Ligand binder design. Structure first.
Ligand SMILES: [K+]
Ligand SMILES: [K+]
Ligand SMILES: [K+]
Ligand SMILES: [K+]
Ligand SMILES: [K+]
Ligand SMILES: [K+]
Ligand SMILES: [K+]
Ligand SMILES: [K+]
Ligand SMILES: [Mg+2]
Ligand SMILES: [Mg+2]
Ligand SMILES: [Mg+2]
Ligand SMILES: [Mg+2]
Ligand SMILES: [Mg+2]
Ligand SMILES: [Mg+2]
Ligand SMILES: [Mg+2]
Ligand SMILES: [Mg+2]
Ligand SMILES: [Mg+2]
Ligand SMILES: [Mg+2]
Ligand SMILES: [Mg+2]
Ligand SMILES: [Mg+2]
Ligand SMILES: [Mg+2]
Ligand SMILES: [Mg+2]
Ligand SMILES: [Mg+2]
Ligand SMILES: [Mg+2]
Ligand SMILES: [Mg+2]
Ligand SMILES: [Mg+2]
Ligand SMILES: [Mg+2]
Ligand SMILES: [Mg+2]
Ligand SMILES: [Mg+2]
Lengths: 181, 124, 260
RNA sequence: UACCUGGUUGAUCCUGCCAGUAGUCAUAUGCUUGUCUCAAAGAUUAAGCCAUGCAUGUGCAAGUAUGAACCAAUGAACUGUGAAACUGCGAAUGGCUCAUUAAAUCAGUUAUAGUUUGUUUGAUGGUAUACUCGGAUAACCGUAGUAAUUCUAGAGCU
RNA sequence: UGAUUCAUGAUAACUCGACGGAUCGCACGGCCGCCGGCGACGCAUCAUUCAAAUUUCUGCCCUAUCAACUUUCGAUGGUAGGAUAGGGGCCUACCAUGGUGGUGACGGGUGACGGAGAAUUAGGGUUCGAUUCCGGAGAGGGAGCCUGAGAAACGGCUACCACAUCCAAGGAAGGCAGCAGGCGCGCAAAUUACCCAAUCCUGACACGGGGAGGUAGUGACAAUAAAUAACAAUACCGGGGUCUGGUAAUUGGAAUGAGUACAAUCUAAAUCCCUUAACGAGGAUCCAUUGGAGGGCAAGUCUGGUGCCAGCAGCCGCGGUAAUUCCAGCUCCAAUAGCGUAAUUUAAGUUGUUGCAGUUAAAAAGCUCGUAGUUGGACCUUGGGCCGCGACCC
């Protein structure tokens, strides 16, 4: 026996049943361009996560409002949706969880929030800035653009202290240029 | 730069006669603080008379740098450490010598000698 | 197989040990002893996983070979010694004494006890019958044989045993209205008073227990352990006081703690 | 995502299948392949055949030292540390494979008032030269045999 | 105890009883030679624990072109034994004639070890389950044993069958379905590495050992995250002169990791990662591919070649001189560090229990009776109030 065999893993996305439908291709490309995604799989995994959350919410809506599992798991689901900024305060019911779209999840990415915070000129500039290790959430630098930012962590998105845009020293391009000068 | 030491999960393990803790090292501007430098800083911090009673290991710098975490033991005296500490850590601290052996060679010699009986086993 | 198993695969270990899935291929197989393998907490687990005194298997060996650990007043050097319910674990160097009780989630918890309270354990009488020479003798579920027991003591009784003198100093008759702790099943660690005993000929006997807050639960006779005469248990209980909480109330407690 | 599309006719509506469309902790194969984490891996056919090496040995204060063994001491049975060997224990676990096997294995659920169980834990133990019995044997030692093997005989000790 | 002529006591005897300590360590004090502590090892009994063995009920794929099977020589039961750790046709002697079967016995097939589970699933379902957890079984095929608490053990023995090794021909030695590795077989699968540091097991044992197990190597099985550029200015195209957008191997400075590497960290020792000096981008050649472009089905009725040939084409079809389909170039499309090709699920309400059909598309037996099976008319304590959703009363 190898102990490593017991580590779990799973798939994060599915491919569409119809590969070449014009309407779906246009909608996916519109979302990808709006949020600077690297491929369709990044949107497909968000759709996969939304599908699992929606299935959970629907299954508790098909149970009584006194069923102790619906009180408990619906409270947990609402806490998770409020924690990541996916739901407002007035939207405090399991019904509103069913109304969530992949747009709501894509709007909470570190790339989208870095772009909307003014730190980057474009969504693609935000993507490169995050992948260049210039962005920290709290004290932790995050080089992963699909990072889902909590509302309590939104106000702590900032330039890295080791980055030239965050008080750090100049990068190798600038330093080499001044050394040439 | 300013290396700040922070001990967490601290306990005084009297059964093994040592102090054990989680060591959090904050080193902005440094790659990582070496184990020897941490030993000297811990000897200063905990007033350790013999700094060969300090053992730090399992260090891990976080993603993005600037800070590291590891585990540290401080033995009340050098005899406690030489009795309770694993040999490889003593070798790391210079309190022991690494005996260079090949396990496979030991196995082959053991089989060959098991084929023989008596005091002539040593000469085989 | 052609004989006894010597190894416990880590996946096949008791779930109340809370052993992690990737810590290795193996779990400590409990040695034979006073408690059953599936219902005990081995000494190595207590020393390394719970009390954090030792960090490795070898460190547990080092601690135990120093003769630092006494189980119910006696020094044990076996790491897989099957310490079980109500056992006293004493370390007469740090001056700490532990009674192995169950929390309401079915997991053994080392409960700190006073020095005087560590001088006795509670044992459950398994059977009373005549031994050799016609001498009456008592046996318990923790493997002890006591000769010349009080004739008023019957099976399923709880006796109070003084570890220093090794005699029954007091006992409790298994009756309706005595506070009990459930030691097996899904209600393990729950504390309540017996309301009635439903007997069925030829099969297991069902005990109906109601806790202090009014919740009612039922369990077999083999999973009930009397801990006090009336509504006052003879030992101290862990923080939960044997009152199981639903996950909603646990979430309420967590929310209140986070808010504070 | 509780989904269909092309194909029989001059055209139509059907039945109906063919083909397409998606998945596979599903295998192989092809092309391609920068970084991180994770991870299966001679099962399918041959439970076919295997060179070589390794996979099981083991010593505490506490069974037995007189190595012609080592360190330290220097009229005493036995200093200590101890190889070897006898004695004790283990090698019935683990690992591997899925050939046989279709109420059989196996699963849940029973039973032993139908039995065995080294070990652990607890308790128990009275009517059968003694200031302590006898004979061997290993290691050791030296005569060997055989092409040869932890193949093997004889002699002297304890 | 649900239940025992049970636990257990007493008595009479019995047995050529492997029982009832001729063992070891440390400390060694108290009384006048005698007593004396803490241990270790060992014997026996009961209990407990670790377990096994046997055992109750229910439950398994396809096949009737398998309808009878079992019973000399055990088949079903009974009696008395023997044997076994113990129940039992388990075996023996005698006796009786039973036992199973369309509610499918018996037989055959399985490219059948069983389960936990796995894939796909609106629900229902279909298919898989050699493999790390549990159970079973085997160690070339059979068979038989010794030791031992525990084995019908195979990294134990004995023999036969089949292979096969060394030989001085007299003999001797065998069992990788352990780890690695090698032949062979194949569509199909890695190193003859390091180590007990972790997990844990084992021994006289804190110490030895462990191809259990871990570490590294190979490894696009599978899975996760995630680069291959971003910005600005000129010029163009714009759109909404101005405003604002997209374009250029244009022009500029910024950014950075792939890589290299001090070092530290990692580690049993190494290594990788994480961290980090110095270095490391312009056609940022630090150059992304795999399939397609008639329809299904996203994307060309562009150019050259071939001319029912070569070829493509899952299917429908294309190709005979103007080929949107072949061979190419250009361009475009999909997915993207991946994608193409060659059992099973979905699609399939094309197996239908949910949920399909049977006048004419495939499909009502020629007709009736009839056993099993399946399915079977209505009828029997209702009201009522009170207290208070429980209870009560009439
Ligand atoms: K068995
Ligand atoms: K043995
Ligand atoms: K069963
Ligand atoms: K029998
Ligand atoms: K009989
Ligand atoms: K034995
Ligand atoms: K180890
Ligand atoms: K050991
Ligand atoms: Mg469907
Ligand atoms: Mg095994
Ligand atoms: Mg009797
Ligand atoms: Mg009989
Ligand atoms: Mg088979
Ligand atoms: Mg299986
Ligand atoms: Mg097979
Ligand atoms: Mg395998
Ligand atoms: Mg298995
Ligand atoms: Mg076997
Ligand atoms: Mg073979
Ligand atoms: Mg055999
Ligand atoms: Mg073998
Ligand atoms: Mg074996
Ligand atoms: Mg490239
Ligand atoms: Mg089209
Ligand atoms: Mg073309
Ligand atoms: Mg039809
Ligand atoms: Mg017709
Ligand atoms: Mg017809
Ligand atoms: Mg009716």
């Amino acid at each position: 026996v190898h102990v490593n065999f017991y580590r779990n893993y799973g798939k994060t996305f599915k491919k569409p049943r119809r590969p070449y439908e014009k309407e779906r291709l246009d909608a996916e490309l519109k979302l990808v361009g709006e949020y600077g995604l690297r491929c369709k799989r990044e949107l497909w995994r968000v759709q996969y996560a939304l599908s699992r959350i929606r299935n959970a919410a629907r299954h508790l809506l098909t149970l009584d409002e006194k069923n102790p599992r619906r009180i408990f798991e619906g409270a947990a689901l609402l806490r998770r949706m409020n924690r990541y900024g996916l739901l407002a305060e007035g939207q405090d019911k399991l019904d509103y969880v069913l109304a969530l779209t992949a747009e709501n999840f894509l709007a909470r990415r570190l790339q989208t929030l870095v772009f909307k915070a003014g730190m980057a000129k474009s969504i693609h500039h935000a993507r490169v800035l995050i992948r260049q290790r210039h962005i920290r959430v709290g004290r932790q630098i995050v080089n992963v653009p699909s990072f889902m930012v909590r509302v309590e962590s939104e106000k702590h998105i900032d330039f890295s202290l080791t980055s030239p845009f965050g008080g750090g020293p100049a990068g190798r391009v600038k330093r080499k240029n001044q050394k040439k000068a | 730069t300013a290396v700040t030491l922070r001990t967490r999960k601290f306990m005084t393990n009297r059964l093994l006669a040592r102090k054990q803790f989680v060591l959090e090292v904050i080193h902005p501007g440094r790659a990582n603080v070496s184990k020897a430098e941490l030993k000297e800083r811990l000897a200063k911090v905990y007033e350790v008379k013999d700094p060969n009673c300090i053992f730090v290991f399992k260090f891990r710098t976080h993603f993005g740098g600037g800070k590291s975490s590891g585990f540290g033991l401080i033995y009340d005296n050098l005899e406690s450490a030489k009795k309770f500490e694993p040999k490889y850590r003593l070798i790391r601290n210079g309190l022991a010598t690494k005996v260079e052996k090949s396990r496979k060679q030991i196995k082959e010699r053991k089989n060959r000698t098991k084929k023989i009986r008596g005091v002539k086993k040593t000469k085989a | 197989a052609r004989g006894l198993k010597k190894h416990l695969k880590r996946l096949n270990a008791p779930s109340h040990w809370m052993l992690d899935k990737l810590g290795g291929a193996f779990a400590p197989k409990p040695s034979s002893g006073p408690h059953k393998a599936r219902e005990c907490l081995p000494l190595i687990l207590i020393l390394r996983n719970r009390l954090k005194y030792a960090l490795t298997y070898r460190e547990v060996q080092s601690i135990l070979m120093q003769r630092h650990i006494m189980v119910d007043g006696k020094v044990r050097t076996d790491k897989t010694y099957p310490a079980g319910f109500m056992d006293i674990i004493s370390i007469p160097k740090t001056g700490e004494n532990y009674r192995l009780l169950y929390d309401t989630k079915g997991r053994f918890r080392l409960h700190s006890v006073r020095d005087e309270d560590a001088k006795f354990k509670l044992c459950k009488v398994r059977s009373v019958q005549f031994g050799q020479k016609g001498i009456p003798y008592l046996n318990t579920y923790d493997g002890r044989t006591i000769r010349y027991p009080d004739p008023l003591i019957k099976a399923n009784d709880t006796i109070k045993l003084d570890l220093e003198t090794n005699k029954i100093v007091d006992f409790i008759k298994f009756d309706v209205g005595n506070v009990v702790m459930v030691t097996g099943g899904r209600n393990t660690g729950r504390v309540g008073v017996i309301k009635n005993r439903e007997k069925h000929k030829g099969t297991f006997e069902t005990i109906h227990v109601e806790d202090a807050q009014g919740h009612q639960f039922a369990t077999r006779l083999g999973n009930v352990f009397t801990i006090g005469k009336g509504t006052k248990p003879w030992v101290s209980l862990p923080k939960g006081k044997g009152i199981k909480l639903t996950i909603i109330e646990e979430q309420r407690k967590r929310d209140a703690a986070a808010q504070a």
